[PDB]
Design a protein around this ligand. Structure first.
Ligand SMILES: CC(C)c1ccc(COc2ccc(CC(=O)NCCN)cc2Cl)cc1
Ligand SMILES: CN(C(=O)c1ccc(O)cc1O)c1ccc(C(N)=O)cc1
Ligand SMILES: [Cl-]
Length: 341
């Protein structure tokens, strides 16, 4: 077959990063333009990460988990090829493309636990030394960020072409998503432990005091990040206080600046020594017989944000999500192939 040829052809192109603005217009332009963009751009993004997978050393590349994930990418690339010569004016071309995108999305659903098996296998077969750790961290950050960007493109297409513009809410109420993610974490926390800390939210709209804080964002991404952080802050708070009676609340601040929308989650869960912070973000060190924090950080990075942890051992932990306030500064952050090693 031609998969290596295709990979070589499309890995010559740079992925084209889109802004929120571009994303919002695509969901007014129309389906034909999404189709002609995506039938080029998906092969480009697939091929760029496939090329990088093929550069892994043989002792990683040869493992069943990587071979299995590589086989999903090959089929998904081939599924998209079928449409390169098809006619955009034919509505059967367009419906079949949508169908093809849903199968591709479904096919890749189990990538994270599959890659996690790969990490486990490597720790036991070759070890968990600091250089292994950096190479795993380097690869998976790029792999998972690539995969977030491909799921975004596919989600935008399948949701728009069946107020919100697919996965984008142009009037996202940040405090409402905070309360949703808290309410869900509390539910699980109450079930597993006999208790759950309360929530306090404070907003700081610097320029418009007392105006509720809204942004253009992908609320499912924001939920994913906040949910992960709530789980961590609830587990720490409950477990560090199980001989105490009082349960300090979790305090969230939502700050809107000129360019940053910042969400701090402050807990009193006893904290982590500085030495152990790096490990919480490490796929390798956080793999035991992917993970929430490292992948939540990629969601934040995806539109030029970040996710930082600062703890005070003996007291508690601050987690901050940094987002861009402005749709104009919210541009896909994409890993690009070439330079290497
Ligand atoms: C996520 C899974 C599948 C996974 C598991 C393990 C790895 C680890 O990959 C390593 C490990 C060590 C080195 C040092 C070295 O030898 N450098 C030169 C390269 N030979 C390089 C790489 Cl790319 C990546 C991804
Ligand atoms: C102590 N501890 C923290 O202080 C802490 C870590 C991360 C976080 O977002 C919030 C925290 O309180 C903490 C550490 C690890 C987990 C975990 N991954 O299960 C949870 C909590
Ligand atoms: Cl789109």
């Amino acid at each position: 077959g031609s998969a290596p040829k295709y990979i070589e052809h499309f890995s010559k192109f740079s992925p084209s990063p889109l802004s929120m603005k571009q994303f919002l217009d695509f969901g007014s332009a129309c389906e034909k333009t999404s189709f002609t963009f995506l039938r080029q751009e998906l092969p480009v993004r697939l091929a760029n990460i496939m090329k990088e997978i093929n550069l892994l050393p043989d002792r990683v590349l040869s493992t069943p988990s990587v071979q299995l994930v590589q086989s999903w990418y090959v089929q998904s690339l081939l599924d998209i090829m079928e449409f390169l010569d098809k006619d955009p004016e034919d509505h059967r071309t367009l419906s079949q493309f949508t169908d093809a995108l849903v199968t591709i999305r479904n096919r890749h659903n189990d990538v994270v636990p599959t890659m996690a098996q790969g990490v486990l296998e490597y720790k036991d077969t070759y070890g968990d030394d600091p250089v292994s750790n950096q190479n795993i961290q380097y690869f998976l950050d790029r792999f998972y960020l690539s995969r977030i960007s491909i799921r975004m493109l596919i989600n935008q297409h399948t949701l728009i072409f069946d107020k919100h513009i697919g996965s984008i809410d142009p009037n996202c109420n940040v405090s409402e998503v905070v309360k949703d993610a808290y309410d869900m974490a509390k539910l699980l926390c109450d079930k597993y432990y006999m208790a759950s800390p309360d929530l306090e939210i404070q907003e700081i709209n610097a320029a418009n005091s007392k105006q509720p804080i809204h942004m253009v964002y992908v609320p499912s991404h924001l939920y994913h990040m906040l949910f992960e952080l709530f789980k961590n802050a609830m587990r720490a708070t409950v477990e560090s206080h199980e001989s105490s009676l009082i349960l300090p609340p979790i305090k969230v601040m939502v700050a809107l600046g000129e360019e940053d929308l910042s969400i701090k989650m402050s807990d009193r869960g006893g904290g982590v020594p500085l030495r152990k912070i790096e490990r919480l973000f490490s796929y390798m060190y956080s793999t035991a017989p992917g993970y929430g924090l490292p992948i939540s950080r990629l969601y934040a990075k995806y539109f030029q944000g970040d996710l930082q942890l600062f703890s005070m051992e003996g007291f508690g932990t601050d987690a901050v999500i940094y987002l861009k306030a402005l749709s104009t500064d919210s541009v896909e952050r994409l890993p690009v192939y070439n330079k290497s090693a």
